[PDB]
Amino acid sequence: SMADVPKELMDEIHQLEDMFTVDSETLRKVVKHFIDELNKGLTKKGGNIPMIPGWVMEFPTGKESGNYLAIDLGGTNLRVVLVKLSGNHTFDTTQSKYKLPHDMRTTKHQEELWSFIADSLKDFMVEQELLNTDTLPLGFTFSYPASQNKINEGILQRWTKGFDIPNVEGHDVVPLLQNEISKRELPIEIVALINDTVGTLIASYYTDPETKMGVIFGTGVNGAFYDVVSDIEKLEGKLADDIPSNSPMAINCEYGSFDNEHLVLPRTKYDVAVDEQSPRPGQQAFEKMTSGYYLGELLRLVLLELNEKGLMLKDQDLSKLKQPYIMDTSYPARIEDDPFENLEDTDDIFQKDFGVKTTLPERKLIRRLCELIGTRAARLAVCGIAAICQKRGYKTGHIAADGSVYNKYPGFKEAAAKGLRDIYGWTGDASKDPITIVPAEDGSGAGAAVIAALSEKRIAEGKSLGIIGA
Numbered sequence: 001s002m003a004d005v006p007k008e009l010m011d012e013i014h015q016l017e018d019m020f021t022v023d024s025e026t027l028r029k030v031v032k033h034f035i036d037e038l039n040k041g042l043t044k045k046g047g048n049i050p051m052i053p054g055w056v057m058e059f060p061t062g063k064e065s066g067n068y069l070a071i072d073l074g075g076t077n078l079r080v081v082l083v084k085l086s087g088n089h090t091f092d093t094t095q096s097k098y099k100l101p102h103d104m105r106t107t108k109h110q111e112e113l114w115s116f117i118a119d120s121l122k123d124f125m126v127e128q129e130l131l132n133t134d135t136l137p138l139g140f141t142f143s144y145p146a147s148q149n150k151i152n153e154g155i156l157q158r159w160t161k162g163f164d165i166p167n168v169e170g171h172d173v174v175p176l177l178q179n180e181i182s183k184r185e186l187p188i189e190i191v192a193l194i195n196d197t198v199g200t201l202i203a204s205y206y207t208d209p210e211t212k213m214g215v216i217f218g219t220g221v222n223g224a225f226y227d228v229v230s231d232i233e234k235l236e237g238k239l240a241d242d243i244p245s246n247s248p249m250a251i252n253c254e255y256g257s258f259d260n261e262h263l264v265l266p267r268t269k270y271d272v273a274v275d276e277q278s279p280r281p282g283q284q285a286f287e288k289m290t291s292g293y294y295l296g297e298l299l300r301l302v303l304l305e306l307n308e309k310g311l312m313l314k315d316q317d318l319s320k321l322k323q324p325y326i327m328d329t330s331y332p333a334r335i336e337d338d339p340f341e342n343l344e345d346t347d348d349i350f351q352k353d354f355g356v357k358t359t360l361p362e363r364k365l366i367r368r369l370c371e372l373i374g375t376r377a378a379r380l381a382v383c384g385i386a387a388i389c390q391k392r393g394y395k396t397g398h399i400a401a402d403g404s405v406y407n408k409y410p411g412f413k414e415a416a417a418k419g420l421r422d423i424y425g426w427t428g429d430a431s432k433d434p435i436t437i438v439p440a441e442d443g444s445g446a447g448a449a450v451i452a453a454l455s456e457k458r459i460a461e462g463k464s465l466g467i468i469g470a
């Protein structure tokens with residue numbers, strides 16, 4: 001409880017509560033502007049929300065069959081996956097995991113990244129003995145901003161989620177990987193570049209036709225959904241006749257860039273601080289305050305400012321806490337996950353990891369802080385779901401969700417659901433909820449394979465997969 005915390009700290013906890021609490025009226029405010037930005041991003045003039053086409057113009061039926069490869073570039077490790085779509089409305093996947101070398105996510109020699117992915121593919125080929133012969137369709141899940149005018153293209157906009165490699169931005173990633181595959185004479189062809197949220201949208205629809213959206217609450221945030229071609233104004237008169245107006249089209253929103261103008265989001269001085277000190281300030285406004293990548297950075301700055309104010313961690317060595325992005329989301333997650341009255345797990349963390357001693361009330365505050373920024377992250381993140389469900393007329397449906405924060409972060413699922421009930425105003429038992437958030441399918445694995453299948457079928461039918469002349 002709080003029945004033994006000094007008045008100095010209780011007054012700070014009350015202010016932190018007031019700034020990190022987002023009521024239902026504010027959520028509804030954010031959502032309305034969110035909807036405008038979604039529409040604006042579909043016009044030629046554009047907007048801060050990219051609204052990138054995914055070039056998937058069909059719903060998976062289940063009758064899809066074949067052997068498709070699918071790689072997934074995460075920040076921690078590369079994931080090669082073989083997917084046998086049986087057509088029984090399920091799949092059989094043989095996968096591998098290849099750890100990323102130390103400085104890889106940050107390497108100055110970009111050729112090492114592609115060289116790594118290609119070599120890892122060859123190992124998977126020899127271990128699965130599938131190095132005889134058709135050309136294996138490959139689905140490449142590249143979950144970073146990348147505009148695409150056709151499905152087998154991905155021009156890197158900017159690195160996120162801890163990635164920083166020199167000469168890849170503004171470049172098509174696909175040929176980089178493709179002509180590395182061909183140097184090793186591997187029987188692979190990149191048939192599709194897919195965003196993790198889109199692969200998720202499709203993998204889940206494949207096994208749940210009630211899937212209205214595929215969202216990621218992970219080290220990054222993003223959401224994909226099926227729109228209709230006619231709604232996408234910017235593609236007006238840039239498409240072939242095999243892509244009609246009533247046609248479905250998976251949209252990769254890339255809405256982590258929402259409100260870069262800063263006109264609705266309840267940013268605080270700590271939020272502004274995180275932004276100003278981040279690699280590229282003025283970017284990812286929405287993402288910076290809901291994303292797993294930044295949640296710990298928030299905690300770090302609040303702790304630092306409360307210290308440089310003679311209120312907390314007095315006469316302690318904050319030498320280790322001074323390093324930016326030293327705290328990832330595991331810290332808030334583990335602090336909130338502390339089962340002990342005296343918060344003994346938390347104590348151990350600041351001692352072993354940062355070499356700083358805390359009193360009991362100091363951990364009482366740290367803990368309540370992790371609750372506030374985590375609950376706000378949830379309540380704000382679901383504003384993208386309500387916005388999409390309302391721009392389209394989705395009265396009911398399932399939202400396929402994945403991500404390390406959705407999955408691992410304590411009480412996040414509950415918070416995201418309550419945040420969603422507050423926005424709509426729903427009252428009673430949660431089973432009555434017309435729209436619910438459900439655990440997603442394998443988006444980067446199964447999903448990408450299901451998209452390679454849908455893509456090869458169009459190639460075979462001679463039909464297009466991008467804008468004319470792309």
Ligand SMILES: OC[C@H]1O[C@@H](O)[C@H](O)[C@@H](O)[C@@H]1O
Pocket residue numbers: 142143144145160161195196197216218219220221222223254256
């Ligand atoms: O990983 C989830 C999301 O992370 C964001 O940082 C990227 O821009 C998106 O492409 C991705 O969908």
